[PDB]
Amino acid sequence: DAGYVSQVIGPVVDVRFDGELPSILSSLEVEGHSVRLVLEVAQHMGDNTVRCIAMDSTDGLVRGQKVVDTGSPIKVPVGRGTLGRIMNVIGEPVDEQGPIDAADIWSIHREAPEFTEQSTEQEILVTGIKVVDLLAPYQRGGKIGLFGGAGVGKTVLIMELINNVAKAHGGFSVFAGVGERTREGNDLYREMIESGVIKLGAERGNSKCTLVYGQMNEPPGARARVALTGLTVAEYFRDIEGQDVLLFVDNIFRFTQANSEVSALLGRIPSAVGYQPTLATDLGGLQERITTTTKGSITSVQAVYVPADDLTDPAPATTFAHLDATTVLSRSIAELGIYPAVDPLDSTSRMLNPNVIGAEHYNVARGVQKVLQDYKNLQDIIAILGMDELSEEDKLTVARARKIQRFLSQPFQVAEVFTGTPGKYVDLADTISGFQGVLTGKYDDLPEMAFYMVGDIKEVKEKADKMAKDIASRKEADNKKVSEELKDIPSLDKLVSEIKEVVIEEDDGLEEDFKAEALSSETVVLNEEGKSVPLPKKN
Amino acid sequence: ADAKALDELRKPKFSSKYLIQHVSQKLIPAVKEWEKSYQPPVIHLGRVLSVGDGIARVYGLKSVQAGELVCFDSGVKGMALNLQADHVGVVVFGNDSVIHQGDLVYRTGQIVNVPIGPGTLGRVTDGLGQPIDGKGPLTNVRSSLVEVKAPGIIARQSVREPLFTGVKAVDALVPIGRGQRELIIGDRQTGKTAVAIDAIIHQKNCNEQVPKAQRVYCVYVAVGQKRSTVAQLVKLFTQTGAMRYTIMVSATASDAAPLQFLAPYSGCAMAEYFRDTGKHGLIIYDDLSKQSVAYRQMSLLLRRPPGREAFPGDVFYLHSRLLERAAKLSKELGGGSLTAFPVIETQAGDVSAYIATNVISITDGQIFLETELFYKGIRPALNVGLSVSRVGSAAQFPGMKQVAGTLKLELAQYREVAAFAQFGSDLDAATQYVLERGARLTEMLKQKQFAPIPIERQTVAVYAATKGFLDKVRVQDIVAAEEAVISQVNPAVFKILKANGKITPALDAHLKAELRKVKLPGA
Amino acid sequence: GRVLSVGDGIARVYGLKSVQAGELVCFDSGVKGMALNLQADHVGVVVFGNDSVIHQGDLVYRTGQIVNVPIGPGTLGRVTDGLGQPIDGKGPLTNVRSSLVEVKAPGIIARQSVREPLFTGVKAVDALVPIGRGQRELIIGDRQTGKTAVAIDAIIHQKNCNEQVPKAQRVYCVYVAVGQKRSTVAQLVKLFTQTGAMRYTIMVSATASDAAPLQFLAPYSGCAMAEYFRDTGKHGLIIYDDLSKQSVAYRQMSLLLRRPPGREAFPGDVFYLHSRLLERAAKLSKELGGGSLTAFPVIETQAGDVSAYIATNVISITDGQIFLETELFYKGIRPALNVGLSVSRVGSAAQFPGMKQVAGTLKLELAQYREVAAFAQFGSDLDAATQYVLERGARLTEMLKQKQFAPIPIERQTVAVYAATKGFLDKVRVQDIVAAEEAVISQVNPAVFKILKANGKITPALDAHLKAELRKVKLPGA
């Protein structure tokens, strides 16, 4: 019937069965454990033993603990009952709001959609971000990679992508938090409680987002499989409901990282730099399920953390081929103060094609990339010569590309709470003309800093107005400002009198709520019969 | 060779019995001839097969749990880490020279736990919970596990309260939050312990001023440091009074590798008491790159396969499950917080190391300490283009938020100009002016050691540089000009600015009034 | 055979006592396999598919045959997977025959000197880095620089040339997609059925979700399907897109079989893996039929680092090299061919003789432009000998630009290089470009293309009319 725990090394449990072994990728329950511990069969060890990875911590497991087979892989609730809920890797509600009332629980493991059911149409997903929609335009029904190191703005960009696309999409979205901070998961959950994407109580069914969370405090088995749980929620929303789905995956790098933490304990000799030998095929088996079939559509946005800003690291370098669009975020762009820190050259999309987006959009994007590459080639001789002799053809292409660099920046709606500037949504025909004007030369009379952190081209020519009014200030300094006390302001000692004085306890509250139990000086052991005895004084 | 005839052999097929009835009455008189050489058999107790380098392979111990405290017969404790099929791999909490082959190992019944509570507040502790300061055992304290799972999404709330550190470079540019994990990273002797220590001293200075619930209880975990440094830190914290709110967990270099591995978890479990009982905690994991090294040794001697720089594969999970326990709880869980300050030492400024990149990807903010800024007089050596924080606004002083934006922008103006400092053309007196203000700002941001500043005296001092009031002095005496500013501006400004939090429109008036009323000696 | 242990697509199988190395086996679950390393106690079997349907104690039957694929003319127009099975949904493969995937490469006396050209339709490749029929030319570069664009332009140009040649000198293309996304290779069959290039194209496709032995065997399956055309007197064009992904799949199979790893955890025989494949691209002698197989392997470097292991292996194996740079791509030069780092060891002996007399000046002018390319961003103008090359080469690099999926015939690229290396180009100020680049091929009368294609050379009775027609160009846009 059941099996027993044979070996526990870290997050990898060897379970021995006496006849009728479970299949690979089957789910096993451990009973006698405090919390619900789910093991997924990774391989067959060979002498009627399976080797498993755990979905929770293996602290507490006993060699010989009864492990029961489920006869199926990890099954999770999918459907309309999961909208507005937070799930585990194994489909438990962790939002503390009842059970998940969804019918037809599905396995998280299936094969990829086959070759004949592949869609070939390409329509542009307009996001409102004038560096995304211009240079590397996204595709609805396509896969999007948000590359970039630690601190460059992947989570802020995916928050703005949620706040732009997923609210005005109609269909359902799925967020898969794969190995990230729990604090920003709580931030996303709160910011979708207020914005009405997630609703609570009786109006729960009017929610449009399903959260599946596998964050950093989880063991490496729970981070390796939580992307499959978010993906099978999105696959139910694509295949059965027929809807068009959004699948935001925060740090798909942590999938490969979580598979790397267990692969030495699974008996695999290591590959290149320290990843598993099965890196490309695990990533392919995950990512080929995220497709647009003939039944429905999944538009996936994926953050990819590059380790130490290395794009040649094999875990993002494998990810690069599975994506339709690619938004590489660069640290040196964010060091200029430009946000979002999208590399305007290194970002690529399949939609940048004159046969798809039009020969005006394509040519203005190629012209912006041409003038930015020209400025990047001139940045060498500027720091040795000084940009004074370049004979007004290379001195103009520096100023135009600097206006383009400042014009690629954009204030975000989600970044108001740490910049202050209100966010901007810039439409596609509204950014093509705005970049065509600064490309052809319609805005050389404007100041260079006026392009920084604005929206449309009808905002740079108002920041020029406000800049030339604000430099029209700071002109006179005789008197009549706030510092002369005669206007409306009290003395400095009278403002002190307006302070309410707070209490000071000086006892810190540590003597009234603590259950100060007694701990033994001697150490207490268990003998052969399991009884609690003191340690025997004979070494 | 397969198991089917191997199970058929369980059925008897001997067909003759001319040895079975001969040796069965000959076995027991033979075994009794050697019963003083036999050791008694073992099932639920343990017996040491092999011991060496801090690892005991223990035969028996049938019902041990993974990660369970065991106790050898010589008194030294252990921890059952990898439970293999024929033996248990036990790491030794101490010197393994008192363990022999054939020593009895006793299962204690408990997963590893430390004493938590208010009784630890003021003690110097080892990495396992025993006090090492020579002041007797721990009283008014209770035992709690060191492997508590971090609070989830519904248990947390957004980080809003500041927890100032007293270092005005930090509190102006990289503002901490009260439940935020902030990594102090740099080379050796670049001032990381100084930043953590000044943070603890400033919590001592603020705990005697706030009403009993914004009080911050520091916990310092010294991993891998020598014992003279820990004793000097205890002398510092007692001679300034910071030891009344500070716990110190000290697994030194002489301790075993599992003690240094377990000491950040012991310190986090001691600091989670204040987080779970509504108070606010501050935890400093000094030398987390030494806890990773102790974990590497402990796992390599358990014969687990090595990875990048021979580290374990799960060395990311080691620091992620530790640092994720620093949270800000919801109001139904008390609202208590715990803010982490892990420390990583880099080698020659290589930020692309394995443990360094892992802990950068785990924590919220970063505090980079470069060794070239340290020797240029900039103390603390904050790398302002690389030190990031996730919170930014809504986690700092509202008065400092109005002033430090003009600092964050103008230091960026200074940095993009100073890469053209070989020629000196001084373009239109604008590239000359922005460096002539940015040098003043970097000289403003310097401060001494073991002397933290209250936040009002910081946001007055940056007010005197983001505005005018210091353009008349050279860059060589701004560290004395700001002493003239704080020393001669009337101290009733600081009370109003602390009680308001921001500058009221009656307060920036009086502050611009009194920054010309003072005589600064800059000539 | 009894499965001892199964995991990560590797089944250790007891028994199978007389099985061959590299032989197909069959499991109880219908999934195929390959006996890869035969040990004294078990057989290490790589699983052609998902190993989750294999259990301990499952019966493994040997098929008695080494891994083979259907080859023949019925493979044309069909999208097959890495084992020859069709995935296009157009029914079973008619008019085919089975042949082994790993055939020994033809020897010295089987070869012939590579003399006839293979036109890619890309004028940078056809002019500077020329290809002959029977050549191995590495398309190397970083990601997203246009390696697949050069390969697909070569296939589309072979379709365009296949309509104006007889039956003998027709090129039949095979595209092997190793480890690509499955939605990417539906765009390619859409583009090939839209252009018409699917009439001559076999497409082998082991995608990223496929098992690592399928991605390992897909280049050999494609090379067998192209060796059908090579062996019967016809001419093939095999393209292994991301051979550096086949190397990764073989690394995965070798590390899961616990074969001892070498540099970057690659096995000892990964050079043997790629050389076994790329030496099957040959130009056969006239005794064997005179057939040819031209290979274009694709290797994705990381940051221009051609000192990687697999990159140095395929550089050491192949004849030439087409290097695509990242900084040339955003500079407007598309196709981003690095002219200084692109080699062709067959060289000028296998190119168009009309191009051979005109591109020889072109590569010297471009090398002179590369020597002086630091002077280009200077304001104080130089001694007017370097200004002449700095204007001439800067217009010649604009003449090598080309848009995607529109390959050019060789007689039009020959007159386009003759219009620029002989001084006929836009020596007026260069805001007249769009009405100046293709004005030559749209305004010169099409008789000279017929004469240049038929003779294959700029004869002394043709260059007079060439200079005459190039002088009377209109440019009506100014």
Ligand SMILES: Nc1ncnc2c1ncn2[C@@H]1O[C@H](COP(=O)(O)OP(=O)(O)OP(=O)(O)O)[C@@H](O)[C@H]1O
């Ligand atoms: N703000 C400061 N002003 C002056 N000196 C300082 C300051 N901060 C640190 N130092 C000096 O720098 C030296 C190194 O300090 P600290 O021990 O904090 O660095 P560390 O990185 O912890 O060193 P280690 O890597 O050896 O642990 C100390 O001797 C201290 O006196």
Ligand SMILES: Nc1ncnc2c1ncn2[C@@H]1O[C@H](COP(=O)(O)OP(=O)(O)OP(=O)(O)O)[C@@H](O)[C@H]1O
């Ligand atoms: N000659 C060209 N003119 C204009 N655009 C081009 C040209 N060649 C390639 N591109 C564009 O460059 C992008 C990348 O091209 P391609 O896929 O051929 O490169 P790749 O190296 O194969 O990329 P990957 O490594 O991601 O497969 C494509 O979107 C294509 O539209």
Ligand SMILES: Nc1ncnc2c1ncn2[C@@H]1O[C@H](COP(=O)(O)OP(=O)(O)O)[C@@H](O)[C@H]1O
């Ligand atoms: N659009 C933006 N505007 C302003 N600041 C930003 C923006 N995006 C990112 N940042 C800064 O970068 C920091 C970290 O960004 P984050 O999204 O956490 O990147 P990652 O997830 O890759 O670490 C934030 O604290 C913020 O200050």
Ligand SMILES: [Mg+2]
């Ligand atoms: Mg993030």
Ligand SMILES: [Mg+2]
């Ligand atoms: Mg230190």
Ligand SMILES: [Mg+2]
């Ligand atoms: Mg490609």
